[PDB]
Amino acid sequence: HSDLTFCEIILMEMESHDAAWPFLEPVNPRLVSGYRRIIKNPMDFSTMRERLLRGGYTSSEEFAADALLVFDNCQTFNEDDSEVGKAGHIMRRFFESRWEEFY
Ligand SMILES: CC(=O)N1CCN(c2ccc(NC(=N)N)cc2)CC1
Ligand SMILES: [Mg+2]
């Protein structure tokens, strides 16, 4: 239990973060040329939200794996100096620092 309440806090905080806009909804491969081919396990904050609300996280580590998948994917598809990439670095650093001051 106590693991999952910290997941709620950090996901709520990532959901309302300024730099969260690229990650709130699943990427739409129809709009994003080449995303289907490059990103084999897409992940986003609303899917983590859907899974967290339904209970589908056994431990905080599974939650963290999805979080890190958001930022691993962001770095695979977007150049570091791109507008989405810059947002993603800000979000990844945010997650990592928040996660470490809980564990
Ligand atoms: C999460 C991720 O990797 N995404 C890449 C594709 N997305 C995107 C949005 C806006 C621009 N820029 C523009 N002028 N339309 C480029 C790409 C957003 C999600
Ligand atoms: Mg990693």
Curated annotation (Swiss-Prot):
It is found in: Nucleus, Nucleolus. Deacetylation by SIRT1 in late S phase enhances pRNA-binding, allowing de novo DNA methylation and heterochromatin formation. Acetylation is high during S phase and declines to background levels in late S phase when the silent copies of rRNA genes are replicated. Ubiquitinated. Deubiquitinated by USP21 leading to its stabilization. It comes from the Eukaryota. Residues 1-102 form the Bromo domain. Expressed at moderate levels in most tissues analyzed, including heart, brain, placenta, lung, skeletal muscle, kidney and pancreas. The bromo domain and the PHD-type zinc finger recognize and bind histone H4 acetylated on 'Lys-16' (H4K16ac). These 2 domains play a central role in the recruitment of chromatin silencing proteins such as DNMT1, DNMT3B and HDAC1. Component of the NoRC-1 ISWI chromatin remodeling complex at least composed of SMARCA1 and BAZ2A/TIP5, which regulates the spacing of histone octamers on the DNA template to facilitate access to DNA. Within the NoRC-1 ISWI chromatin remodeling complex interacts with SMARCA1; the interaction is direct. Component of the NoRC-5 ISWI chromatin remodeling complex (also called the NoRC nucleolar-remodeling complex), at least composed of SMARCA5/SNF2H and BAZ2A/TIP5, which regulates the spacing of histone octamers on the DNA template to facilitate access to DNA. Regulatory subunit of the ATP-dependent NoRC-1 and NoRC-5 ISWI chromatin remodeling complexes, which form ordered nucleosome arrays on chromatin and facilitate access to DNA during DNA-templated processes such as DNA replication, transcription, and repair. Both complexes regulate the spacing of nucleosomes along the chromatin and have the ability to slide mononucleosomes to the center of a DNA template. Directly stimulates the ATPase activity of SMARCA5 in the NoRC-5 ISWI chromatin remodeling complex. Belongs to the WAL family. This is Bromodomain adjacent to zinc finger domain protein 2A. It comes from Homo sapiens.
